Amino acid sequence: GMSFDINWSTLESDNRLNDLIRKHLNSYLQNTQLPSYVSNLRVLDFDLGKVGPAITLKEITDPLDEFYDSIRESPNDIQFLLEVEYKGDLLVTIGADLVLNYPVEKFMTLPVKLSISDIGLHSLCIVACLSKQLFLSFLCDVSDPALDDNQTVLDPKGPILAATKPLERISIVRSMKIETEIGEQYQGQGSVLRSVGELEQFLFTIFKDFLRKELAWPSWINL
Amino acid sequence: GMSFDINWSTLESDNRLNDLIRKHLNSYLQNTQLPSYVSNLRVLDFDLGKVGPAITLKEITDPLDEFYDSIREESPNDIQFLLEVEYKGDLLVTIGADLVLNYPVEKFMTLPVKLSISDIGLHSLCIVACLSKQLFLSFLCDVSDPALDDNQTVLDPKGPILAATKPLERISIVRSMKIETEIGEQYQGQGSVLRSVGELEQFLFTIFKDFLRKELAWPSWINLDFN
């Protein structure tokens, strides 16, 4: 490709944007139900990073007709079909309050720190634009099995775009790293470490679901 | 900012884009009048590079009306970006030249010679307009151009930038450039050869600048269409 360094300070600040994303994500978190062992989940900080994705424009066409059906509830309009490969420094700092003991009740609360980072990604996205609104979406994973025999992704009767069989499609996100810091007080006993463990499992699944319902086809991010 | 790698291979081409630029640069060279010391100028190879510019968003607006009559020529919502572009990438031009030497006697000798233009410095204000269905890029100004003091907005059509376009009244889009020259090592001894080479390097420098002026600098512009 070719190396670009893009700065949009005057459109919206990195601070501003990061906090917009942070507020969405918090909106997803405080609107999902929480388990036994976690009492409070919130996004402390979000940082999109200084490292972006490798974008490969593969096709350019008119927007899909499902958009026109979406607005019937022209022209000028154009959709990009892009092969996006992200291996960057997106960082989500999440705070939580873990509930410690089965015995008796509510024995102790703990402040805990989780860090979602190093998000791996190879995927097919479409970015459509139609007066006025701009449309970004993650369609597929590049190595998803229903692209075999070179069948174009933009086929509406295809399984991709139909989304008739979500179970069979490989997850958009290929890699992820969730780390967890607790006070050195509690690194000693395994009960705490176990609760931490499935806290990170739960967080993994929660994030999985977030991207599924926000970014994955059929779920749209709209500007 | 944020680091992007953009690839437009699906639409040609690294080869075909390079060869297009090469063909039109050759078109410029073969159509420019030459000094006595250089007989022939030609483009051996062109390579846009793997390194692009640092782009900073500098406001946004609806496209200038000049576009719309340059389309009466022949739509909301079209849009124009005003960009601070800073290029110091790896653009590489390999140019062949025929050197004329006539020291003793007359037209004594001509010398196949090979020049390398590289490290093109650039810091400028560009505008990228998109109207159905066409995308228009043009380099308006140099960042440190004197008609940008007063903080007079560039997009003022009555302002000098956009209206004037006078040949020498705006600092050249191109700030820096480095030209190397390869000749037969048997000729590295003679000073006359080296001096002719120097004059050639300067002349080539100039030529390339005005080429980029005539191709990129407002009111000249580049068109990419989707049809």
Short mmCIF file of C-alpha atoms in Angstrom, two decimals:
data_model
loop_
_atom_site.label_atom_id
_atom_site.label_comp_id
_atom_site.label_asym_id
_atom_site.label_seq_id
_atom_site.Cartn_x
_atom_site.Cartn_y
_atom_site.Cartn_z
CA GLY A 1 0.00 0.00 0.00
CA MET A 2 1.07 3.55 0.80
CA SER A 3 1.72 5.12 4.21
CA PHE A 4 -0.61 7.96 5.25
CA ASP A 5 -0.67 9.89 8.52
CA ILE A 6 -4.14 11.38 8.90
CA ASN A 7 -4.97 14.12 11.41
CA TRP A 8 -8.53 15.35 12.01
CA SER A 9 -7.97 17.53 15.08
CA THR A 10 -10.22 20.32 13.80
CA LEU A 11 -13.15 18.07 12.84
CA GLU A 12 -13.40 16.45 16.26
CA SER A 13 -10.72 16.12 18.94
CA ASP A 14 -9.17 12.76 19.77
CA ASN A 15 -10.44 13.45 23.28
CA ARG A 16 -13.94 14.18 22.00
CA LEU A 17 -14.11 11.12 19.75
CA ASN A 18 -12.63 8.78 22.36
CA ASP A 19 -15.22 10.00 24.86
CA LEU A 20 -18.03 9.55 22.32
CA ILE A 21 -17.03 5.92 21.83
CA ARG A 22 -16.55 5.58 25.59
CA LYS A 23 -20.08 6.84 26.15
CA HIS A 24 -21.57 4.47 23.56
CA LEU A 25 -19.82 1.56 25.10
CA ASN A 26 -20.83 2.57 28.59
CA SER A 27 -24.36 2.77 27.20
CA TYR A 28 -24.08 -0.86 26.13
CA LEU A 29 -22.56 -1.91 29.46
CA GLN A 30 -25.02 -0.31 31.88
CA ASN A 31 -27.83 -1.68 29.71
CA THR A 32 -26.70 -5.31 29.99
CA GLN A 33 -27.53 -7.44 33.03
CA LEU A 34 -24.73 -8.35 35.43
CA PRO A 35 -23.81 -11.67 37.14
CA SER A 36 -23.48 -12.78 40.75
CA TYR A 37 -19.87 -11.77 41.10
CA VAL A 38 -19.73 -8.39 39.35
CA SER A 39 -21.74 -5.49 40.75
CA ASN A 40 -20.57 -2.58 38.61
CA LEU A 41 -19.19 -2.44 35.06
CA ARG A 42 -18.06 0.87 33.50
CA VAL A 43 -15.68 2.13 30.80
CA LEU A 44 -13.07 4.27 32.52
CA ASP A 45 -11.15 5.27 29.45
CA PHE A 46 -11.20 4.64 25.73
CA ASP A 47 -8.33 5.35 23.35
CA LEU A 48 -8.61 4.74 19.60
CA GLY A 49 -4.83 5.02 19.34
CA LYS A 50 -2.17 6.51 17.09
CA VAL A 51 -2.05 3.40 14.88
CA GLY A 52 -4.73 2.73 12.27
CA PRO A 53 -5.67 -0.12 9.89
CA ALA A 54 -4.39 -1.29 6.51
CA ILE A 55 -7.20 -0.55 4.08
CA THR A 56 -7.47 -2.18 0.66
CA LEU A 57 -10.19 -0.85 -1.64
CA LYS A 58 -11.37 -3.95 -3.50
CA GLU A 59 -14.63 -2.85 -5.15
CA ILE A 60 -16.68 0.32 -5.59
CA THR A 61 -20.35 0.24 -6.54
CA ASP A 62 -23.79 1.65 -5.83
CA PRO A 63 -25.08 1.09 -2.28
CA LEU A 64 -26.98 -2.15 -1.59
CA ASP A 65 -30.74 -2.04 -2.12
CA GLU A 66 -31.36 -2.94 1.53
CA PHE A 67 -30.30 0.63 2.27
CA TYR A 68 -33.03 1.92 -0.06
CA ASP A 69 -35.49 -0.37 1.69
CA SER A 70 -34.13 0.96 4.98
CA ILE A 71 -34.98 4.51 3.94
CA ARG A 72 -38.26 3.74 2.18
CA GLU A 73 -39.55 3.07 5.68
CA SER A 74 -30.69 8.97 -5.05
CA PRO A 75 -28.11 9.23 -6.84
CA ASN A 76 -24.70 10.94 -5.99
CA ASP A 77 -24.47 7.95 -3.70
CA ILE A 78 -21.59 5.49 -3.58
CA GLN A 79 -20.49 2.50 -1.54
CA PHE A 80 -16.91 1.42 -0.95
CA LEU A 81 -16.02 -2.25 -0.43
CA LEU A 82 -12.85 -2.47 1.66
CA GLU A 83 -10.54 -5.16 2.96
CA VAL A 84 -9.62 -3.85 6.41
CA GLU A 85 -6.72 -5.29 8.39
CA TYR A 86 -6.35 -3.88 11.90
CA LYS A 87 -3.47 -4.88 14.18
CA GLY A 88 -3.35 -1.62 16.09
CA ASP A 89 -3.25 -0.01 19.51
CA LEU A 90 -6.93 0.39 20.39
CA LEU A 91 -7.22 0.38 24.19
CA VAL A 92 -10.29 0.00 26.39
CA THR A 93 -9.77 0.54 30.12
CA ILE A 94 -12.74 -0.95 31.97
CA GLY A 95 -13.38 -0.78 35.70
CA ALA A 96 -15.39 -3.19 37.75
CA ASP A 97 -16.44 -4.15 41.26
CA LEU A 98 -16.12 -7.87 41.90
CA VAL A 99 -18.23 -9.51 44.63
CA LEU A 100 -15.93 -11.81 46.63
CA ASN A 101 -17.53 -14.70 48.56
CA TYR A 102 -20.28 -17.29 48.13
CA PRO A 103 -20.16 -17.95 51.88
CA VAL A 104 -22.62 -15.88 53.88
CA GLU A 105 -23.34 -12.90 51.64
CA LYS A 106 -21.50 -9.96 50.08
CA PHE A 107 -18.31 -10.68 52.15
CA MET A 108 -16.15 -8.22 50.24
CA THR A 109 -16.23 -5.82 47.30
CA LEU A 110 -13.12 -5.26 45.21
CA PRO A 111 -12.08 -2.52 42.80
CA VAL A 112 -10.69 -4.23 39.70
CA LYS A 113 -9.05 -3.01 36.49
CA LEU A 114 -9.46 -4.65 33.08
CA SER A 115 -7.65 -3.76 29.87
CA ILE A 116 -8.92 -4.79 26.45
CA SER A 117 -6.12 -4.38 23.93
CA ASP A 118 -4.29 -5.66 20.86
CA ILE A 119 -7.41 -6.25 18.78
CA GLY A 120 -6.62 -8.41 15.76
CA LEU A 121 -8.78 -8.03 12.68
CA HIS A 122 -9.04 -9.06 9.05
CA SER A 123 -12.44 -8.27 7.60
CA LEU A 124 -14.59 -6.98 4.76
CA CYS A 125 -16.39 -3.71 5.42
CA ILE A 126 -18.66 -1.57 3.28
CA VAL A 127 -18.77 2.19 3.67
CA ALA A 128 -21.83 3.56 1.92
CA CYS A 129 -22.77 7.21 1.49
CA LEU A 130 -26.16 8.57 0.52
CA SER A 131 -27.55 12.06 1.13
CA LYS A 132 -27.11 12.89 3.86
CA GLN A 133 -26.08 9.94 5.96
CA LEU A 134 -22.82 7.99 5.96
CA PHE A 135 -22.92 4.24 6.56
CA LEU A 136 -20.15 2.07 7.98
CA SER A 137 -20.36 -1.71 8.36
CA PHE A 138 -18.34 -4.82 8.97
CA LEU A 139 -19.66 -7.43 6.53
CA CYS A 140 -17.42 -10.42 6.82
CA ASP A 141 -14.17 -12.04 7.85
CA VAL A 142 -11.81 -12.33 4.89
CA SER A 143 -11.26 -16.07 5.45
CA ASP A 144 -14.95 -16.90 5.98
CA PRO A 145 -15.88 -20.21 4.27
CA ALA A 146 -18.74 -18.84 2.12
CA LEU A 147 -16.39 -16.75 -0.02
CA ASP A 148 -14.80 -19.94 -1.34
CA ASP A 149 -15.06 -20.40 -5.11
CA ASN A 150 -14.71 -16.60 -5.33
CA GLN A 151 -18.37 -15.78 -4.76
CA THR A 152 -18.66 -12.01 -4.46
CA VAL A 153 -19.71 -10.75 -1.03
CA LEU A 154 -22.15 -8.20 -2.44
CA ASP A 155 -24.55 -10.95 -3.55
CA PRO A 156 -27.76 -10.25 -1.56
CA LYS A 157 -28.98 -13.85 -1.88
CA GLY A 158 -25.55 -14.90 -0.59
CA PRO A 159 -25.37 -16.05 3.06
CA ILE A 160 -23.27 -13.02 4.11
CA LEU A 161 -25.72 -10.29 3.26
CA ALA A 162 -28.80 -12.36 3.98
CA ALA A 163 -27.41 -13.10 7.45
CA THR A 164 -29.75 -16.08 7.44
CA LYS A 165 -27.21 -18.31 9.18
CA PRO A 166 -25.18 -16.30 11.76
CA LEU A 167 -24.01 -19.45 13.51
CA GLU A 168 -21.82 -20.54 10.62
CA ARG A 169 -19.98 -17.29 10.04
CA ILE A 170 -16.50 -16.74 11.54
CA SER A 171 -16.28 -13.90 14.09
CA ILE A 172 -15.16 -10.54 12.69
CA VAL A 173 -12.60 -10.14 15.47
CA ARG A 174 -9.82 -12.72 15.26
CA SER A 175 -7.66 -11.67 18.23
CA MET A 176 -7.96 -9.89 21.58
CA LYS A 177 -6.15 -9.41 24.87
CA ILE A 178 -7.87 -8.88 28.22
CA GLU A 179 -5.60 -8.22 31.19
CA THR A 180 -6.58 -7.64 34.80
CA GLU A 181 -5.03 -5.81 37.69
CA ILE A 182 -6.16 -6.25 41.27
CA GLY A 183 -4.59 -5.04 44.47
CA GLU A 184 -1.56 -7.08 45.50
CA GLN A 185 -3.60 -7.80 48.65
CA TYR A 186 -5.60 -10.47 46.91
CA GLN A 187 -3.24 -12.14 44.41
CA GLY A 188 -2.65 -14.70 47.15
CA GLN A 189 -5.92 -16.62 47.25
CA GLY A 190 -7.42 -18.43 44.27
CA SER A 191 -11.09 -17.64 44.99
CA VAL A 192 -10.32 -14.08 43.94
CA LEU A 193 -8.35 -15.28 40.89
CA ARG A 194 -11.26 -17.50 39.81
CA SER A 195 -13.82 -14.72 40.13
CA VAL A 196 -11.41 -12.53 38.15
CA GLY A 197 -11.12 -15.33 35.60
CA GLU A 198 -14.75 -15.68 34.63
CA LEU A 199 -15.08 -11.90 35.00
CA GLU A 200 -12.71 -11.65 32.04
CA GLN A 201 -14.62 -14.45 30.31
CA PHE A 202 -17.87 -12.52 30.79
CA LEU A 203 -16.20 -9.34 29.58
CA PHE A 204 -14.89 -11.14 26.50
CA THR A 205 -18.38 -12.40 25.64
CA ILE A 206 -19.90 -8.99 26.40
CA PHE A 207 -17.50 -7.24 24.01
CA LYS A 208 -18.11 -9.99 21.43
CA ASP A 209 -21.80 -9.21 21.63
CA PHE A 210 -21.19 -5.44 21.51
CA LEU A 211 -19.32 -5.61 18.22
CA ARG A 212 -21.89 -8.08 16.92
CA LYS A 213 -24.79 -5.72 17.62
CA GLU A 214 -22.99 -2.53 16.59
CA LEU A 215 -20.59 -3.34 13.75
CA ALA A 216 -21.39 -6.83 12.32
CA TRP A 217 -23.69 -7.24 9.27
CA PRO A 218 -26.75 -6.83 9.88
CA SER A 219 -25.82 -4.15 12.57
CA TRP A 220 -24.90 -0.53 11.32
CA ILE A 221 -22.88 2.38 12.57
CA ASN A 222 -24.51 5.55 11.26
CA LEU A 223 -23.15 9.09 10.95
CA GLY B 1 -2.55 11.77 13.67
CA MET B 2 -3.18 8.10 12.86
CA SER B 3 -1.26 5.69 10.62
CA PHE B 4 -3.04 4.33 7.54
CA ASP B 5 -1.90 2.01 4.76
CA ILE B 6 -4.03 2.65 1.67
CA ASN B 7 -4.01 0.22 -1.26
CA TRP B 8 -5.87 0.70 -4.55
CA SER B 9 -4.59 -2.38 -6.41
CA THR B 10 -8.08 -3.57 -7.33
CA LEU B 11 -8.23 -0.40 -9.38
CA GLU B 12 -5.04 -0.08 -11.42
CA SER B 13 -2.38 0.49 -10.81
CA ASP B 14 1.03 0.61 -9.13
CA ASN B 15 2.29 -0.23 -12.61
CA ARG B 16 -0.33 1.59 -14.69
CA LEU B 17 -0.55 4.68 -12.47
CA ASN B 18 3.25 4.96 -12.50
CA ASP B 19 3.26 4.52 -16.28
CA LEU B 20 0.51 7.11 -16.73
CA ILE B 21 2.47 9.68 -14.75
CA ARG B 22 5.58 8.62 -16.69
CA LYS B 23 3.84 9.04 -20.04
CA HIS B 24 2.60 12.54 -19.23
CA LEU B 25 5.92 13.63 -17.70
CA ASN B 26 7.60 12.44 -20.88
CA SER B 27 4.88 14.36 -22.70
CA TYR B 28 5.96 17.47 -20.80
CA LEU B 29 9.70 16.93 -21.36
CA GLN B 30 9.45 16.20 -25.07
CA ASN B 31 7.32 19.34 -25.39
CA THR B 32 9.70 21.67 -23.56
CA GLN B 33 12.38 23.64 -25.40
CA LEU B 34 15.92 22.56 -24.57
CA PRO B 35 19.21 24.42 -23.90
CA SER B 36 22.30 24.02 -26.06
CA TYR B 37 24.00 21.69 -23.57
CA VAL B 38 21.18 19.13 -23.41
CA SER B 39 20.03 17.37 -26.58
CA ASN B 40 17.38 14.99 -25.29
CA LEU B 41 15.27 14.60 -22.15
CA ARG B 42 13.28 11.44 -21.44
CA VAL B 43 11.70 9.62 -18.50
CA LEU B 44 13.31 6.25 -17.87
CA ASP B 45 11.20 5.23 -14.88
CA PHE B 46 8.68 6.69 -12.44
CA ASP B 47 7.76 5.40 -8.99
CA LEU B 48 5.21 7.14 -6.76
CA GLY B 49 6.53 5.18 -3.78
CA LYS B 50 5.40 3.25 -0.71
CA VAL B 51 5.37 6.37 1.48
CA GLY B 52 2.60 8.96 1.34
CA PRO B 53 1.97 12.44 2.82
CA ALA B 54 0.96 13.62 6.28
CA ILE B 55 -2.56 15.00 5.87
CA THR B 56 -4.13 17.33 8.42
CA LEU B 57 -7.79 18.24 8.20
CA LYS B 58 -8.12 22.01 7.90
CA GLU B 59 -11.84 22.75 7.98
CA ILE B 60 -14.53 21.60 5.55
CA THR B 61 -17.02 23.23 3.19
CA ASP B 62 -19.25 22.86 0.15
CA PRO B 63 -17.27 22.87 -3.12
CA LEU B 64 -16.33 26.13 -4.86
CA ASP B 65 -18.79 27.22 -7.57
CA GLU B 66 -15.96 26.97 -10.10
CA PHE B 67 -16.49 23.22 -9.90
CA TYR B 68 -20.19 23.60 -10.62
CA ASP B 69 -19.64 25.64 -13.78
CA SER B 70 -16.78 23.26 -14.57
CA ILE B 71 -19.78 20.92 -14.52
CA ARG B 72 -22.16 23.29 -16.34
CA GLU B 73 -19.45 22.22 -18.63
CA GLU B 74 -21.37 19.11 -19.33
CA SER B 75 -25.99 17.89 -6.82
CA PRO B 76 -26.34 17.81 -3.00
CA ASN B 77 -24.67 16.81 -1.01
CA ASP B 78 -21.27 17.13 -2.65
CA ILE B 79 -18.41 18.08 -0.28
CA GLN B 80 -14.94 19.62 -0.25
CA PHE B 81 -12.08 18.98 2.19
CA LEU B 82 -9.42 21.64 2.84
CA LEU B 83 -6.22 19.75 3.65
CA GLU B 84 -2.81 20.68 5.02
CA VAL B 85 -0.63 18.22 3.10
CA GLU B 86 2.98 17.58 4.08
CA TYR B 87 4.79 15.26 1.66
CA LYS B 88 8.36 14.16 2.23
CA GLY B 89 7.96 10.66 0.89
CA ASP B 90 9.86 8.42 -1.48
CA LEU B 91 8.74 9.67 -4.88
CA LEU B 92 11.40 8.64 -7.39
CA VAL B 93 11.95 9.85 -10.94
CA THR B 94 14.65 8.33 -13.13
CA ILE B 95 15.33 10.60 -16.10
CA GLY B 96 17.60 10.02 -19.08
CA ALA B 97 19.49 12.94 -20.60
CA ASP B 98 21.84 13.50 -23.53
CA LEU B 99 24.59 15.91 -22.51
CA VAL B 100 26.10 18.20 -25.14
CA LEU B 101 29.80 19.03 -24.77
CA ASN B 102 31.66 21.24 -27.26
CA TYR B 103 34.90 22.28 -25.60
CA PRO B 104 37.62 21.87 -28.28
CA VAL B 105 36.10 22.46 -31.76
CA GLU B 106 32.31 22.13 -32.21
CA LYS B 107 29.47 19.94 -30.85
CA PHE B 108 32.46 17.79 -29.84
CA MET B 109 30.65 15.01 -27.97
CA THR B 110 27.29 13.91 -26.60
CA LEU B 111 27.02 11.93 -23.38
CA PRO B 112 24.31 9.49 -22.32
CA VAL B 113 23.64 10.55 -18.72
CA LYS B 114 21.25 9.33 -16.01
CA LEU B 115 19.58 11.52 -13.36
CA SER B 116 17.67 10.65 -10.18
CA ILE B 117 15.08 13.01 -8.73
CA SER B 118 14.14 12.10 -5.16
CA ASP B 119 13.17 13.32 -1.70
CA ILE B 120 10.62 15.84 -2.95
CA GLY B 121 9.73 18.15 -0.08
CA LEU B 122 6.22 19.57 0.02
CA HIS B 123 4.04 21.50 2.45
CA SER B 124 0.89 22.92 0.95
CA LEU B 125 -2.84 23.57 1.10
CA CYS B 126 -4.92 21.30 -1.11
CA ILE B 127 -8.63 20.95 -1.67
CA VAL B 128 -10.33 17.66 -2.45
CA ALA B 129 -13.82 18.06 -3.92
CA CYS B 130 -16.23 15.22 -4.47
CA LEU B 131 -19.29 15.75 -6.66
CA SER B 132 -21.42 13.05 -8.29
CA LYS B 133 -19.72 11.14 -9.49
CA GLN B 134 -16.31 12.77 -9.73
CA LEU B 135 -13.45 13.40 -7.32
CA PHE B 136 -11.35 16.52 -7.80
CA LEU B 137 -7.97 17.18 -6.21
CA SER B 138 -6.00 20.40 -6.55
CA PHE B 139 -3.08 22.02 -4.76
CA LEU B 140 -4.11 25.57 -3.91
CA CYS B 141 -1.34 27.13 -1.94
CA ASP B 142 1.96 26.79 -0.12
CA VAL B 143 1.54 26.93 3.66
CA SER B 144 4.02 29.80 4.02
CA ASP B 145 2.75 31.84 1.10
CA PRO B 146 2.64 35.59 1.85
CA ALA B 147 -1.02 35.95 0.82
CA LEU B 148 -1.98 33.76 3.79
CA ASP B 149 -0.88 36.25 6.43
CA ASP B 150 -3.78 38.42 7.73
CA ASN B 151 -5.21 34.89 8.19
CA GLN B 152 -7.27 35.61 5.08
CA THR B 153 -9.21 32.42 4.42
CA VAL B 154 -7.91 30.59 1.37
CA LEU B 155 -11.36 29.67 0.11
CA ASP B 156 -12.15 33.33 -0.61
CA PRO B 157 -12.64 33.34 -4.40
CA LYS B 158 -11.95 37.08 -4.56
CA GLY B 159 -8.75 36.42 -2.62
CA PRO B 160 -5.47 36.13 -4.52
CA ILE B 161 -4.98 32.32 -4.13
CA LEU B 162 -8.11 31.20 -5.90
CA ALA B 163 -8.47 33.98 -8.41
CA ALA B 164 -4.91 35.17 -9.17
CA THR B 165 -2.83 32.14 -10.25
CA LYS B 166 -0.26 34.53 -11.64
CA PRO B 167 2.92 32.55 -12.54
CA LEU B 168 5.36 34.04 -9.98
CA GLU B 169 3.11 35.54 -7.33
CA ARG B 170 2.73 32.37 -5.30
CA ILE B 171 5.70 30.54 -3.79
CA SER B 172 6.13 27.25 -5.66
CA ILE B 173 4.16 24.27 -4.38
CA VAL B 174 7.46 22.36 -4.39
CA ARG B 175 9.87 23.37 -1.62
CA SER B 176 12.70 20.87 -1.88
CA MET B 177 14.12 18.30 -4.29
CA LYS B 178 17.34 16.36 -4.63
CA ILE B 179 18.86 15.42 -7.97
CA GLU B 180 21.71 12.95 -8.35
CA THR B 181 23.58 12.29 -11.58
CA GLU B 182 25.34 9.19 -12.88
CA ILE B 183 27.86 9.41 -15.71
CA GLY B 184 30.62 7.12 -16.96
CA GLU B 185 33.42 7.10 -14.39
CA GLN B 186 35.89 7.89 -17.17
CA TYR B 187 34.35 11.36 -17.30
CA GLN B 188 34.53 12.05 -13.56
CA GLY B 189 37.91 13.69 -14.15
CA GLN B 190 36.88 16.56 -16.42
CA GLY B 191 35.47 19.67 -14.76
CA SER B 192 33.61 20.82 -17.87
CA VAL B 193 31.52 17.65 -17.79
CA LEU B 194 30.75 18.23 -14.11
CA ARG B 195 29.70 21.84 -14.74
CA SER B 196 27.45 20.90 -17.66
CA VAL B 197 26.01 18.25 -15.33
CA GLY B 198 25.37 20.96 -12.74
CA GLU B 199 23.57 23.24 -15.18
CA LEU B 200 21.56 20.21 -16.27
CA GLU B 201 20.62 19.32 -12.68
CA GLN B 202 19.38 22.87 -12.09
CA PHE B 203 17.47 23.03 -15.40
CA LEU B 204 15.87 19.65 -14.65
CA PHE B 205 14.95 20.82 -11.16
CA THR B 206 13.17 23.87 -12.60
CA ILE B 207 11.47 21.83 -15.33
CA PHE B 208 10.09 19.32 -12.83
CA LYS B 209 8.78 22.07 -10.56
CA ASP B 210 6.84 23.76 -13.32
CA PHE B 211 5.59 20.34 -14.39
CA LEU B 212 4.10 19.79 -10.94
CA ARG B 213 2.74 23.35 -11.07
CA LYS B 214 1.09 22.73 -14.41
CA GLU B 215 -0.38 19.41 -13.27
CA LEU B 216 -1.28 19.88 -9.59
CA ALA B 217 -1.36 23.56 -8.67
CA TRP B 218 -4.66 25.47 -8.83
CA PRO B 219 -6.27 26.18 -11.17
CA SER B 220 -4.81 23.02 -12.69
CA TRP B 221 -6.28 19.88 -11.16
CA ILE B 222 -6.55 16.07 -11.20
CA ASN B 223 -9.75 14.11 -11.93
CA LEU B 224 -10.76 10.66 -10.78
CA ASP B 225 -14.15 9.50 -12.06
CA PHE B 226 -16.54 6.71 -11.02
CA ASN B 227 -18.97 5.84 -13.77
#
